[PDB]
From a paper:
Neogenin (NEO1) acts as an attractive guidance receptor when the Netrin-1 (NET1) ligand binds, but it mediates repulsion via repulsive guidance molecule (RGM) ligands. NEO1 is a single-pass transmembrane receptor belonging to the immunoglobulin (Ig) superfamily, composed of 4 N-terminal Ig-like domains, followed by 6 fibronectin type III-like domains, a single transmembrane helix, and an intracellular domain. Secreted netrins comprise an N-terminal laminin (LN) domain followed by three laminin epidermal growth factor-like repeats (LE1-3) and a C-terminal Netrin (NTR) domain. Structural studies on binary NET1-DCC and NET1-NEO1 complexes have identified the three NEO1 membrane-proximal FN domains as the NET1 binding sites (Finci et al., 2014; Xu et al., 2014).
We further interrogated stoichiometry and architecture of the ternary complex using size-exclusion chromatography coupled to multiangle light scattering (SEC-MALS), and cryo-electron microscopy (cryo-EM). The ternary complex composed of NEO1FN456, NET1ΔNTR and RGMBECD could be readily formed on SEC. The peak fraction contained all three proteins and was further analyzed using SEC-MALS. The experimentally determined molecular weight (MW) (422.7 ± 2.8 kDa) matched the calculated MW of the glycosylated complex (433 kDa) confirming the presence of the 3:3:3 assembly in solution. We further analyzed the same sample with cryo-EM. Single particle analysis of the NET1-NEO1-RGMB complex revealed their trimeric symmetry, consistent with the complex determined by crystallography.
Author numbering:
A (entry chain B): 834 to 862, 879 to 911, 917 to 1083
B (entry chain N): 138 to 142, 160 to 169
C (entry chain D): 356 to 453
D (entry chain F): 169 to 263, 268 to 323
The structure:
């Protein structure tokens, strides 16, 4: 509370001119409730590319209305927050996850005003999957020095769904023709550039790049226009 | 074991 | 203290605030570790040492690096994650089992 | 984007779209560019891709990707350390985000300035002068093409 204190000098004839001052009293300290014991034996069991089941135990358990809380987060994208989910049983099934990405898991117990901190961090990495997005930023430019050679530049797709082992480049004069007509030019996954030699003159070239994975192959991308003089 | 046993710099900044 | 200083100085500060110690009145405390980025005279000179209650053995940690005394060879900075090949256990004595 | 090569050469190259700065058998660097003003000479980097090659005994192949309004402290695989968890050869430190690679003596410094990212790489001479067959396009080592250059 904010008190206003007034001081007056008084004698037998009466009270004098007052002197005022105000002060705000310091808040009473409140003791924090003693915390609970956190859950033990936290194990991550990977089931699929988007599902991981979390199992934890409780030494306090020999009725109560105590509920457990689960949290998980991936480092990509940046500065993201932990996804929370409530569980009344000793296990929880995590859904809606990305394939081939490391996740951190921990559990806490909440009884009321009294609640325990997060349990020991258990890491669970999702299973790999067939890529669901084609490689973005397809850029083709004429090389200064040796015009018969033209360099193709690509970036990895957003939905890689696993460790990329290779890349397949497709180039042909006609777009309407199927994949069997287009020449196959596969490369290594660790390299995102490839020099193409012996290219025909006065022919419009079209490009399509695909990504390689242990589970399958990446989808097709839109062709780009590039003509040779 | 895994370690290396003159440093050259490379910069890139927008306008 | 005036006798031990060789008749130089003998003034010792009373009830040191802002979690400091010594007659000089600058120092750090247990359950806490020193931040190397800022000097000892600074307010935020000692960071909180958040040692895990089931992971770490003790509360008092390493003052220069900020490492909690881990049990069963835990790799965690605050003794929060089990080591390679080790799985989380129900026992309070052995938190990680190979 | 203002270029500063290992040979201490300053060149103002447009480098529109995906262009490789560093390309060898030890480290891969890929950057894409978009103009701040539509249909103008001025350009700026929007996405940086760092690929570490699969080396036996030290670290597995980990792909790093950084875009606009996104400064990750880890790779697309979600992991913070290269290869095995016990291996401390490849590490990423955040504050400004920095990369440390003791197996190839490199230090990459990345940070968001305004609406576009910044880049700074420190690498030794021997590792910077490594090149395989059909690998001669390096903007970090050699000068950028005259076609992209403005004079
Ligand atoms: C868990 O339950 C508490 C209490 O009902 C609530 O405050 C909290 O938001 C719940 N969280 C989720 C994710 O269900």
């Amino acid at each position: 509370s904010h008190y206003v204190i007034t001081l007056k000098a008084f004698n037998n004839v009466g009270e004098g001119i007052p002197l005022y001052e105000s002060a705000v009293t310091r808040p009473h300290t409140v003791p924090d409730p003693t915390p609970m014991m956190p859950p033990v034996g936290v194990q991550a069991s990977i089931l699929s590319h988007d599902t991981i089941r979390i199992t934890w135990a409780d030494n306090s358990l020999p009725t109560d209305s105590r509920y457990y809380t689960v949290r998980w987060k991936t480092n990509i994208p940046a500065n993201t927050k932990y996804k929370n989910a409530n569980a009344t049983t000793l296990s929880y099934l995590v859904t809606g996850l990305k394939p081939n990405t490391l996740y951190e898991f921990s559990v806490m117990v909440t009884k009321g005003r009294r609640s325990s901190t997060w349990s020991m961090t258990a890491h669970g990495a999702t299973f790999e999957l067939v890529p669901t997005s084609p490689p973005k930023d397809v850029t083709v430019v004429s090389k200064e020095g040796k015009p018969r050679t033209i360099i193709v530049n690509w970036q990895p797709p957003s939905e890689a769904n696993g460790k990329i082992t290779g890349y397949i480049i497709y180039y042909s004069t006609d777009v309407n023709a199927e994949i069997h007509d287009w020449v196959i030019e596969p490369v290594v996954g660790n390299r995102l550039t490839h020099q193409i030699q012996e290219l025909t003159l006065d022919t419009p070239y079209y490009f399509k790049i695909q990504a390689r994975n242990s589970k399958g192959m990446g989808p097709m991308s839109e062709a780009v226009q590039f003509r040779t003089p | 074991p895994c370690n290396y046993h003159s440093y050259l710099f490379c910069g890139l900044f927008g306008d | 203290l005036y006798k031990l200083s060789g008749r130089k100085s003998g003034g010792v500060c009373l009830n040191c605030r802002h979690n400091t110690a010594g007659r000089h009145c600058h120092y750090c405390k247990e359950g806490y570790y020193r931040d190397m980025g800022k000097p000892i005279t600074h307010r935020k000179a000692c960071k909180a040492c958040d040692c895990h209650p089931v992971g770490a053995a003790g509360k008092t940690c390493n003052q220069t690096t900020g490492q909690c005394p881990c049990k069963d060879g835990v790799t965690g900075i605050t003794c929060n994650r089990c080591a390679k090949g080790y799985q989380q256990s129900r026992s309070p004595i052995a938190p990680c089992i190979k | 984007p203002h270029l500063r090569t290992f040979k201490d050469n300053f060149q103002t190259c447009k480098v529109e779209g995906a262009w490789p700065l560093i390309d060898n058998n030890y480290l891969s660097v890929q950057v894409t560019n978009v103009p701040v003003v539509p249909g103008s000479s001025a350009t700026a980097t929007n996405k940086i891709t760092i690929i570490f090659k699969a080396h036996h005994e030290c670290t597995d192949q980990k792909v790093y990707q950084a875009v606009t309004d996104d400064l990750p402290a880890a790779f697309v695989d979600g992991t913070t350390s290269g290869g095995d968890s016990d291996a401390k050869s490849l590490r990423i430190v955040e504050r400004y985000v920095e990369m440390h690679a003791r197996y190839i003596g490199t230090t990459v410094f990345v940070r968001q300035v305004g609406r576009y990212l910044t880049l700074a790489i420190r690498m030794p001479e021997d590792l910077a002068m490594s090149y395989e067959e059909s690998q001669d396009l390096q903007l970090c080592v050699n000068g950028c093409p005259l076609s992209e250059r403005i004079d």
